[PDB]
């Protein structure tokens, strides 16, 4: 005759799980929160601030097991990171909300591990939607909410009253590292993309619009003589781009993806910024006090991602990213006195298998280092020519 | 099927603004929130502490539109002031609720811009009525509760569940400025009366009962044999005071004001001290164990507002105050080494008109300054004298 | 038409008071909250670190009213201490609830005095249950719970919906000695048992099953190749001990007290360390992968309690005990330079009576202490002889 919370829960709390993690760049160690993704698989999903340079993941479910977990793929423009559970059984998943259709009134329920006490829960209701700007270089397009969140809960579960996932417990404002009412998750959907792409590559593959822009607001609105205070200003479009192709014109105002209404220009790059080429989409537009639609098709990109580091651990050098199909790990452009190049790596390089094992991509290669061979074999390609580089 | 405060905040969300304000007194910058409290004059209430000493305010709706707001009036003691948005269109101003009817168990959403991310809502319950001793020189009645407020927060809504408004937020009790747990509101009777004051003369005009007290506590009532752990115990009544024609003699204990039981001296101190002079209002009396009811009607006083500065923005000297009926604004006491007294400024002068503009009362006086002219020629009588003073 | 908790804590509400507490170890004050346990004796709960080296306690209702208290019980180890009102009128007590069928969905309020600003309600949910660790000497099986809890909370309320005591509220984790989300309360099912020692002793009597043992942590459960990932790892029992008796062997898991499932080790010492000597229990057993019941009845020892300084308020020295029925005070061993020893004070004494009255066991004593004698002469037996101590 009481109203809980427990019911739900009950479902739901295996679902998340408690990480430690050991490191180095100087030794150290870390913990935080994790949400189970995949059953079957073992796959968890969690901020890649938390496991980010790690030696060693452990993972530990709500019932006590803990289990050894290896990366898959790793985020640092989102802050988002897969890691899989190293022989899952009888593990329990999470299934995901829209995180699209939240509204500010909407109560919410934290869960996670502050301070390594333990798996905890607090509740709160969303305080704002679409809050960005905490790291300017980051897709950022955070769920705001009051459930006490402090240090340790990164890489939880934020979950409506149903026991869906709505997002992923990422940061607070605070001065003096106490929680104070004010915490971030990065939305459900943006977590839905990222990971799957992950899953099936190692990392993401970043499409474009190839638009500069801005925020709209008030003021450059009346310079522009535009009724609308909030959206996505274009300052230009890029030649040869999706854009350009689609008729996108600068002085435009973007002011809807796919039907939902666009917060700000932050927002859109953090959607898009989410979503795999060649992935067709469609702009609400605004050019001269006229609505526009328009269809687009997201395209190739420069994207800064996987440093060697991120696969090596600890070997800087060189930045690395799939090519083409399932055609092997490219090396993008070493550096110089880095690591990598001091045991001939050269840009331009094409990793298509390691140890007699064939990789299509990082995933199949991070495969091979999770085994922790003595000796790494590198089977490269330069120009037309076969090579090995070896390691230890 | 779930539960949400979404449906409500949805009607509600427009009404609280946010506001920045430049000033100097040595250049700053400050922000919080403000509600609006009546959408066709564009008047929104806010914190006096907020504004105060500001030479620009800017107020920013939830959909991203700016306004300039100047200026209407303000309560220091009270920490209540009204601005107005100049040029207010298509606004959505909040219901007030009956803050007497309020109970500790009841559940608030506060709504307000925290550290200037935006339009944030948290929420919480009634902790606490009738809190004061924040600033013991003030009136204060302070709602308690436990939604999160930060800094950035002050002047904006806290609201039941219906969406009314209950009290404006305004303090916190918090070691580090970070939330803990505990804030404070001003009850919103006391924000409906003061405000429309302000709308209607540019200053609270402060009414007296012309008593003395102090709070009745448990050891002070065995002193005095009184059944009451609580109440205004009356130490003195003034000669030729409302309390003194009413028949209220010293050692009697207040424990009613009109209807309504007394949490203690200040909170009576606090309701009155916001009720406009000549209010017709209604005493429970204790005197020798016996119950007595008394009628009342609210006198002059002495209160001391508006400095010169206030109104001039950085001409300190002489206080100053409406007069009689619309009979103009009067200098209350000029200092000596003040800038005021340094352009002639001499108590007992009655500013009747400003730029060949009429002066009935503080508001059209500031009103002619929210204009910004370069010469401003007082037109004042001395004696029986018009002069005229000029100023740049 | 709206929902509060306002009817439920207007019949609550006076059940929980404010404490003033005076002492010297150098002069000090504090406050905290308490409980109403019993209304007519005046009985009153709250944390043993509140009024701990107290020389006076003042109790202060939620009407106003203020009543002197005098220390009845205290159990540092569990931080539970018993006060009683000095001439108890019109009262109202808390109806507990009982704690173990508390879930982590569940809705909580705390109520208590936050920096002594009065009455303050908080709400939140249970986050989690049987936190220990906080102090690793003590026993502690804490309700973890979300609701605001600050300094001068402690020895509060905390409650369900329908307004049942579940648990005191004791300790925050909190940088900066503010709230962040997390706090503590003991159940209320421990503090059923230790007050209601206390009543009729003035202390806790102590029972144990004598064996040692630790938590059954995963890595710990392979080594031993067992099916469970918590509990209470037998690592050996205690020659004639209740456990021995029973047919405990060293290397056995216990996963249950009396039906209840056993978080770990620390919940188990906690529970049993509650339980009054002589109490019937039965343990759920885990020897080589097969489940087994066990009867057991809980035995004396050696618990290291009530120091002479306890009941003296400052005469350091040996520490004291009841002894077998109600025989008197039993001094148990004491030091050297310490000042009880220094009144004729040797171990192995038997306090008899005090000033003409009878002394069966602790609370007797301090309530012949309570009237606060200028000499107090205390009839003791040294082997088989009568001889009397005096003080001042």
Same mark, same amino acid.
């Given at each position: 005759?009481?109203?809980?919370?427990?019911?739900?829960?009950?479902?739901?709390?295996?679902? %998340?799980?408690?990480?430690?993690?050991?490191?180095?760049?100087?030794?150290?160690?870390?913990?935080?929160?994790?949400?189970?993704?995949?059953?079957?698989?073992?796959?968890?999903?969690?901020?890649?601030?938390? %496991?980010?340079?790690?030696? %060693?993941?452990?993972?530990?479910?709500?019932?006590?097991?803990?289990? !050894?977990?290896?990366?898959?793929?790793?985020?640092?423009?989102?802050?988002? =990171?897969?890691?899989?559970?190293?022989?899952?059984?009888?593990?329990? =998943?999470?299934?995901?909300? !829209?995180?699209?259709?939240?509204? +500010?009134?909407?109560?919410?329920? @934290?869960?996670?591990?502050?301070?390594?006490?333990?798996?905890? /829960?607090?509740?709160?209701? +969303?305080?704002?939607?679409?809050?960005?700007?905490?790291?300017?270089?980051?897709?950022?397009?955070?769920?705001?909410?009051?459930?006490?969140?402090?240090?340790?809960?990164?890489?939880?579960?934020?979950?409506?009253?149903?026991?869906?996932?709505?997002?992923?417990?990422?940061?607070?404002? =605070?001065?003096?590292?106490?929680?104070?009412?004010?915490?971030?998750?990065?939305?459900?959907?943006?977590?839905?993309?990222?990971?799957?792409?992950?899953?099936?590559?190692?990392?993401?593959?970043?499409?474009?619009?190839?638009?500069?822009? $801005?925020?709209?607001?008030?003021?450059?609105?009346? @310079?522009?003589?535009?009724?609308?205070?909030?959206?996505?200003? /274009?300052?230009?479009?890029?030649?040869?781009?999706?854009?350009?192709?689609?008729?996108?014109? =600068?002085?435009?105002?973007? $002011?809807?993806?796919?039907?939902?209404?666009?917060?700000?220009?932050?927002? &859109?790059?953090?959607? %898009?910024? $989410?979503?795999?080429?060649?992935?067709?989409?469609?702009?609400?537009?605004?050019?001269?006090?006229?609505?526009?639609?328009?269809?687009?098709? &997201?395209?190739?990109? *420069?994207?800064?991602?996987? !440093?060697?580091?991120?696969?090596?651990?600890?070997?800087?050098? @060189?930045?690395?990213?799939?090519?083409?199909?399932?055609?092997?790990? +490219?090396?993008?452009?070493?550096?110089?006195? $880095?690591? @990598?190049?001091?045991?001939?790596?050269?840009?331009?390089?094409?990793?298509?298998?390691?140890?007699?094992?064939?990789?299509?991509?990082?995933?199949?290669?991070?495969?091979?280092?999770?085994?922790?061979? *003595?000796?790494?074999?590198?089977?490269?390609?330069?120009?037309?020519?076969?090579?090995? &580089?070896?390691?230890?």
């Amino acid at each position: 005759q009481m109203p809980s919370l427990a019911p739900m829960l009950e479902k739901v709390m295996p679902s %998340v799980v408690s990480i430690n993690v050991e490191g180095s760049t100087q030794k150290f160690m870390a913990l935080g929160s994790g949400v189970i993704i995949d059953a079957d698989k073992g796959y968890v999903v969690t901020n890649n601030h938390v %496991v980010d340079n790690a030696t %060693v993941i452990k993972v530990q479910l709500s019932d006590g097991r803990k289990f !050894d977990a290896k990366m898959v793929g790793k985020d640092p423009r989102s802050d988002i =990171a897969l890691i899989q559970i190293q022989n899952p059984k009888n593990l329990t =998943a999470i299934k995901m909300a !829209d995180s699209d259709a939240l509204r +500010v009134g909407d109560y919410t329920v @934290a869960i996670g591990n502050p301070f390594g006490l333990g798996e905890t /829960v607090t509740s709160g209701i +969303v305080s704002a939607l679409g809050r960005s700007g905490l790291n300017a270089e980051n897709y950022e397009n955070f769920i705001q909410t009051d459930a006490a969140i402090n240090r340790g809960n990164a890489g939880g579960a934020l979950v409506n009253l149903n026991g869906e996932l709505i997002g992923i417990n990422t940061a607070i404002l =605070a001065p003096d590292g106490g929680n104070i009412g004010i915490g971030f998750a990065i939305p459900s959907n943006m977590v839905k993309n990222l990971t799957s792409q992950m899953v099936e590559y190692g990392q993401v593959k970043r499409g474009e619009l190839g638009i500069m822009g $801005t925020e709209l607001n008030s003021e450059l609105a009346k @310079a522009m003589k535009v009724d609308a205070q909030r959206g996505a200003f /274009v300052s230009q479009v890029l030649p040869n781009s999706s854009a350009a192709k689609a008729g996108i014109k =600068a002085g435009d105002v973007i $002011t809807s993806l796919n039907g939902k209404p666009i917060s700000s220009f932050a927002a &859109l790059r953090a959607q %898009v910024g $989410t979503m795999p080429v060649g992935s067709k989409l469609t702009l609400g537009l605004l050019r001269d006090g006229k609505q526009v639609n328009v269809n687009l098709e &997201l395209q190739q990109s *420069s994207q800064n991602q996987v !440093d060697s580091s991120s696969i090596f651990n600890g070997i800087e050098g @060189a930045e690395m990213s799939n090519k083409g199909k399932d055609q092997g790990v +490219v090396v993008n452009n070493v550096k110089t006195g $880095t690591p @990598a190049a001091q045991i001939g790596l050269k840009k331009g390089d094409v990793i298509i298998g390691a140890n007699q094992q064939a990789v299509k991509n990082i995933a199949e290669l991070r495969k091979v280092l999770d085994s922790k061979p *003595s000796v790494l074999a590198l089977n490269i390609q330069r120009g037309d020519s076969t090579i090995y &580089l070896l390691m230890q």
